[PDB]
Assembly symmetry: D2
Homo-oligomer: 115 residues x 4
C-alpha cells in the first residue's frame, strides 16, 4: 500500500480493532476532500486505502474515530477523533505508514516514510 494506518490502544495494550478511519486530501479551495475510509483490522491496521496512481502529492489528514472507543472505560476523550496531518510525496514515490498510539487524553503518532 502507498498508505497504511496502524492504531494501537495504549490503555489496554492491544491493537485498536474495528475503529473507523477517514482520510482526506486538501483540495484547491482549502477544503478537506474525502479520500478513503475503512475500519481497522484485528491487527489495528487499515490496508488497501488507495492506489499508487490515486495517491497524488498533497496534504492529507488521517482522522481516527475515537468518540466512543473509550466508552467501556467510563471516559469521555479529549476529542471525537485523533487527527494527524501529513504532507505527502514531494520527491518521487513514497509509501507512508501512519502509526498512532491512542489514549483518551493523549496520543503519539509517527509517520514512517519509505522509498
Amino acid at each position: 500500500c502507498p498508505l497504511m494506518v496502524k492504531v494501537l490502544d495504549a490503555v489496554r495494550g492491544s491493537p485498536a480493532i474495528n475503529v473507523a478511519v477517514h482520510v482526506f486530501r486538501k483540495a484547491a479551495d482549502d477544503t478537506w476532500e474525502p479520500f478513503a475510509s475503512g475500519k481497522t483490522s484485528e491487527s489495528g491496521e487499515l490496508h488497501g486505502l488507495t492506489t499508487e496512481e490515486e495517491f497524488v502529492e498533497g496534504i492529507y489528514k488521517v482522522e481516527i474515530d475515537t468518540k466512543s472507543y473509550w466508552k467501556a472505560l467510563g471516559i469521555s476523550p479529549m476529542h471525537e477523533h485523533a487527527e494527524v496531518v501529513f504532507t505527502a510525496n514531494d520527491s518521487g514515490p513514497r509509501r507512508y505508514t501512519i502509526a498512532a498510539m491512542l489514549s483518551p487524553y493523549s496520543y503519539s503518532t509517527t509517520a514512517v516514510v519509505t522509498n
Copy 2:
C-alpha cells in the same frame, strides 16, 4: 488562564522557543476561524491566549508552526505544522493545557484538563 500551550523539542531536549502557535475554533460554516495566536516563551510555554469569557464550548485546533524549525537539523518534517484538535468545555470553566513533544516525523500530545 483558560488555555495554555507548552511545546518541547524532543530531538534537542529543550523547550521549543519562539515558535508560532495559531489557535482556531471550528466556525458555523465548518471552517477554522482564527481564535488566538502567540509565540512560545523561553520555557516553551504560551500563556494569555484567551479569556475565560472568550473561550466558549466548541472544537479548537492548536497549530504549531514547525516548517523551518528543524532547518538546522537538515530534516524536512512530516508536515509544516503540528496540529492538535480538542473539544472544549462541556460543563463550565475548564482550564486546558495542551503539551506537545515534537520531532520531525512524530509527536506526542496530551491535553490536561482541570477543575
Copy 3:
C-alpha cells in the same frame, strides 16, 4: 531544581497526583543506589529532589510507581513502574526535567536539559 519530574495521566487528562517516584543513581559496582524519592504534587510535579552539590554526573533512573494507579480503571498496567534512565551532566551544570505521559500500556517521556 537540578532535577524535576512531571507526570501526566494520559488516560484521564490530568496531572498524576500523589504518585510515588524513586530516583536511583548507578553505583561504582553497577547497582542502582537510592538517590531521592517522594510523591507528586497537585500539578503532577516532584520538586526539591536534590541539590546542586548532590546531583553529580552519572546515570540516573527515574521510577514512577504505577502499579495500582490504574486500579480504579479496572486495568492492570504493563509494569509496576514507568522507568526512565538518563545520563546526567557531562559538561557544566544542567537542570533536568523528566516529563512522563503515562497510560497502562504506553508512555512517552522527554528529558528537557537546560544549562542554568
Copy 4:
C-alpha cells in the same frame, strides 16, 4: 513469536535499521540476566528472540542501543539506551510486541499483549 520488538526513528520518519536490542530478565539476585539479543531488520523489527518455553513469567527489560545512532545528526542523546521494562505473562502464553518511537531526548513505547 512470543516477543517481538519494533523500533521507529521519529526524527527521520523511518524504521530504525540494524539497531542492537538486548533483552534481560530480572534474576534471583535482583540483577538483569541476559535473555535474548538481535538486530532490527530493514523494517525496524526484531523477530525470533525467544520461544514460548523460555519466555516464562517475570520482569523483562528491552534495551535498545541508541548511543551512536543519531551521531550523523550531530546530537548526543539523553542516554546510550532506550529502555522499556515490562512484567510478563501472567496466565498462559501472551504474545508481546514492544513498539518504540525513538528521538534523542524522548521516546514513546507501547506494549501490545495479545492471545
